[PDB]
Design a protein around this ligand. Structure first.
Ligand SMILES: *[C@@H]1O[C@H](CO)[C@@H](O)[C@H](O)[C@H]1NC(C)=O
Lengths: 220, 12, 212
């Protein structure tokens, strides 16, 4: 199976450098070029450059002087570095592979790496239960969730029961509070009859702050 | 439109 | 650079209907155009290469046509799974450039929200902050009103809303309204009510609790 896995998301201070590692498998960097594309709020999708099979690189024009791409064929790793970031360099960065060795139709993408350029500091979330009760149980169906509060920067991941519960799960888009910190809720609906039997746990991972929390959510 | 980095979806 | 203009900005169709996305180039580019899908939280998925050529694993309902400067991506019978943004990419000229994307939204029948209200946790209260969450679950269409009342006082400016993207299975939305108070303020009051208004409700639904 062809795959590309990028290093995790995080903060970069203004005027600092971005480093992302792409680890590929299912093919050899000696036979394929690896491309970098980002996705920004303003410009949208924007091709940044490529490191070719033989090690040659091209960079899109405006990144000539601040982009460097390298790789280690043996380790199947491609390294992306970009100097002196500013706020508008906040984007999701991706690595991609084309269908053929020389081409640009991107059939394989990394999962992306959300990079935030900000002067602030990283802060993990506190995780609070959103407890089911009668005020949240209508017609045999109960709602329950986790409040994931006061973190920075995005993103944060939430799953339920280690991935085993996905049906009826809504994880809300984060909102920025006046504190400059993000907050979101993740909720799920389950049979009320299972509240006694089943354990419900929201798994929260804030990769930028290395905060992993498992919050058990119970009726009060 | 605008590209939302949280949802990876267009936002209008 | 070649500028790719995708129009319109938003498409809204009903399931089973056919839909077309337009990609226009600022300069002739042959058939050197590729198309991508972006679902909620995903990376782009390649749908069509070189205007019209199939990609393996992609449903047959996806096709594309055009040459020169005027291109079309087509879904002959849209499914709810097709909710996404759609991008075109040119590579006749270096550097390769992408359009700005078109949003595909699905219509469905009206569905009233289920409303649930969640008091602050005793856990959160220990920090000197109270969040009161009001959930509106699985409704259509997106428009909804959440009005907050604390002891019959209308709350304003102290709540934030968040709406999920459209669900790929049932095409509904869910909404969270979060009311935020100091612990001190929260403690000084008793009745917390969120009131919900929606096209599918024949009258507003109120969910509420008394603190303790
Ligand atoms: C960021 O600002 C620079 C000018 O300093 C501009 O040339 C560039 O296009 C901007 N990039 C984005 C992604 O907005």
């Amino acid at each position: 199976q062809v795959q590309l896995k990028q290093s995790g998301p995080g903060l970069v201070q203004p005027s600092q450098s971005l480093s992302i590692t792409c680890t590929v498998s299912g093919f050899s960097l000696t036979n394929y070029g690896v491309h970098w594309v980002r996705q920004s709020p303003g410009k949208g999708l924007e091709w940044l450059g490529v490191i070719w099979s033989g090690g040659n690189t091209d960079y899109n024009t405006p990144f000539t002087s601040r982009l460097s791409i390298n790789k280690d064929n043996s380790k199947s790793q491609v390294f992306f570095k970009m100097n002196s970031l500013q706020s508008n360099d906040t984007a999701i960065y991706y690595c991609a592979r084309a269908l053929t060795y020389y081409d640009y139709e991107f059939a394989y993408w990394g999962q992306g790496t959300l990079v935030t350029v900000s002067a602030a500091s990283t802060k993990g979330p506190s995780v609070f239960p959103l407890a089911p009760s009668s005020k949240s149980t209508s017609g045999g169906t109960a709602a329950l969730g986790c409040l994931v509060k006061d973190y920075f920067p995005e993103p944060v991941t939430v799953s339920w029961n280690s991935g085993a519960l996905t049906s009826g799960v809504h994880t809300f888009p984060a909102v920025l509070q006046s504190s400059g910190l993000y907050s979101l809720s993740s909720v799920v609906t389950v049979p009320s009859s299972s509240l006694g039997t089943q354990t419900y746990i929201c798994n929260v991972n804030h990769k930028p702050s290395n905060t992993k929390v498992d919050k058990r959510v119970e009726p009060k | 439109c605008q590209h939302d980095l949280s949802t990876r979806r267009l936002k209008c | 650079d070649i500028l790719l203009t995708q129009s319109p900005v938003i498409l809204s169709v009903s399931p089973g209907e056919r839909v077309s996305f337009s990609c226009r180039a600022s300069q002739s580019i042959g058939t050197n155009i590729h198309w991508y899908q972006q679902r909620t939280n995903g990376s782009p998925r390649l749908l069509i290469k070189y205007a019209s050529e199939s990609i393996s694993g992609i449903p047959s309902r996806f096709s594309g046509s055009g040459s020169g400067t005027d291109f079309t991506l087509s879904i002959n019978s849209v499914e709810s799974e097709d909710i996404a943004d759609y991008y075109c990419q040119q590579n006749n000229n270096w550097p390769t450039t992408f359009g700005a994307g078109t949003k595909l939204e699905l219509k469905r029948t009206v569905a009233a929200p289920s409303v649930f209200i969640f008091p602050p946790s005793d856990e959160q209260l220990k920090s000197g902050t109270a969040s009161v969450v009001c959930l509106l679950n699985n409704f259509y269409p997106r428009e909804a009103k959440v009005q907050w009342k604390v002891d019959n006082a209308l709350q304003s400016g102290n709540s934030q809303e968040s709406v999920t993207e459209q669900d790929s299975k049932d095409s509904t939305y869910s909404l969270s309204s979060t009311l935020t108070l100091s612990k001190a303020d929260y403690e000084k009051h008793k009745v917390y009510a969120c009131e919900v208004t929606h096209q599918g409700l024949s009258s507003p639904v109120t969910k509420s609790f008394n603190r303790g």
